[PDB]
Design a protein around this ligand. Structure first.
Ligand SMILES: [Cl-]
Ligand SMILES: [Cl-]
Lengths: 314, 316
């Protein structure tokens, strides 16, 4: 919701260059994909953005302002989303699971949209994408690479600012949600935890599988707390039996550490130290941050020849 | 089948060391595991080895000779297995699949055993193993680390030799089946193929799902071949409609390259360059090769030290 038009601008930027040079197909792996043709920005945005119908922004050729337009419309939702996190459950011994940190307030977007609708379908740039076996991040990497290769010097300056913008919000959301621990190596995670006075526990975020989470215990002994007395339990939430005092506790006992010091701390070591065994919703996020941070672009070749112009990638 | 007793000996040496020092538990991932107790070599092998009953070997305290014992029983099977590979199927255009390389001859082991039975079950060293979620290779590394940390010099010299034995055969088998490509990074895989005159195709090995395979095309143009005329088809081979000349063709057109040149080439670059995206039976095979080659042991600490009601050590 906060990096989508940043991505969209990069996708348009490549299309603007390719169409400008009469290039109609791209070679991904060993297949040829035929690019769609777009009249203007409104045409492209209408095609690749889910939420295009709802907002009706007016976007110029200043791509650094594309996200800002959305940012100004939704205002507080933008910062609140980036800093937001889910409900946190802790299983101290057995058999029950307790809500130790409550989720951030629910955000209502324009049109009562859903987080999926803000996605930009980089596959809609191709007419025959249905045959494509590439994920969103690599496609973003693909279009970003085209702008670096064929873009002007000023265009590359814009691409870099856009990539940088994606990294900042994407990483921050990852730290703020507590999901950063699962996305880097155990050794580095513990170093940052040691350095930042965080406590490592085994916890569940929303409906996700249990994972490694690091929380700020706020000068508390997690051994000494009575979870039955203090907190509500996940099965209790289902029964809609809720003790307000116990629910109130989830607000005040612990927090997820997202201040600038851990944020800087992780960013220095995040890029190098991604987990060997990772997959899922989280992996795309990790793929994205790594590329936008390091900026290792793919290579683009021009296919040479009554021509149809084309280019290849890996 | 060819490195199993090499692995078993490493496990016994650790048990021998730990028991010699009255140590009953190991700490793996903030957990405590209780070691089983073994009277002798036959007691341990009978418990951790699937095939112990079948062979009934007599194993001495020269552990480097443990594998040699099994090797003499099975003889030709050892070399044939290490160099063996499965059926290779190629889908040239669209809907049909052809046998382009025939599998090696069927091997019959003693008792007509199955390759799973040759496994050394390193969790059977612990009584409370069922909550343990650690793979075979990581366990071997754990026991190897114990032999390095607490073992005598003679024992450490044996361990180095045993590890070396495991590396050589496991890697050669990985090279011989054509599966090495899936266990390393694409660029390095492409590099070795280029240096070794290999052709990269998309192929299926046995009943496995499709993957990337590199074959020696023996100076052949895979574009110019008529697979329908030349080769049998996976459906045909399965149903036993077989053309004698076509099956013969699968013997002679291409080969899987496992000679020393490529073997050395892969051995130099394999350990550093394991594939980011890897899993299956193949991944454990890769971890094992990586560890035995590099030989970077874990750290073994005595927490409770020489004097305690229960003696223990920790790891990871
Ligand atoms: Cl986002
Ligand atoms: Cl083997």
């Amino acid at each position: 919701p906060t990096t989508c038009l940043n991505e969209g601008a990069i996708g348009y930027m490549a299309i603007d260059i390719l169409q400008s040079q009469n290039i109609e197909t791209i070679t991904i792996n060993d297949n040829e994909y035929k690019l769609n043709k777009f009249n203007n920005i409104k045409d492209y945005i209408s095609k690749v953005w889910g939420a295009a119908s709802v907002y009706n922004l007016d976007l110029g050729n200043d791509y650094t302002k594309w996200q800002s337009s959305l940012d100004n419309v939704e205002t507080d939702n933008i910062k609140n989303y980036i800093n937001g996190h889910d409900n946190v459950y802790y299983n101290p011994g057995g058999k029950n699971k307790y809500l130790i940190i409550e989720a951030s307030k629910e955000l209502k977007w324009k049109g009562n949209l859903n987080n999926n609708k803000f996605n930009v379908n980089l596959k809609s740039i191709f007419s025959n994408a249905e045959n494509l076996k590439v994920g969103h991040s690599d496609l973003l990497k693909l279009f970003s690479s085209i702008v670096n290769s064929k873009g002007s010097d000023n265009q590359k300056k814009v691409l870099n600012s856009l990539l940088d913008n994606i990294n900042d919000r994407r990483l921050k959301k990852l730290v703020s949600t507590g999901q950063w621990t699962e996305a880097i190596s155990d050794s580095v995670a513990n170093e940052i935890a040691k350095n930042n006075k965080l406590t490592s526990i085994k916890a569940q975020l929303g409906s996700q599988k249990t994972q490694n989470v690091m929380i700020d215990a706020n000068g508390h002994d997690l051994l000494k707390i009575d979870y039955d007395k203090t907190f509500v339990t996940a099965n209790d939430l289902k029964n809609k039996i809720i003790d307000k005092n116990k629910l109130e506790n989830a607000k005040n006992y612990f927090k997820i550490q997202n201040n600038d010091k851990i944020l800087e701390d992780i960013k220095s070591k995040f890029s190098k130290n991604i987990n060997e065994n990772i997959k899922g919703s989280i992996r795309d996020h990790a793929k994205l941050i790594e590329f936008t941070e390091n900026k290792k672009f793919n290579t683009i070749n021009d296919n040479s020849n009554s021509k149809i112009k084309s280019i290849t990638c890996k």
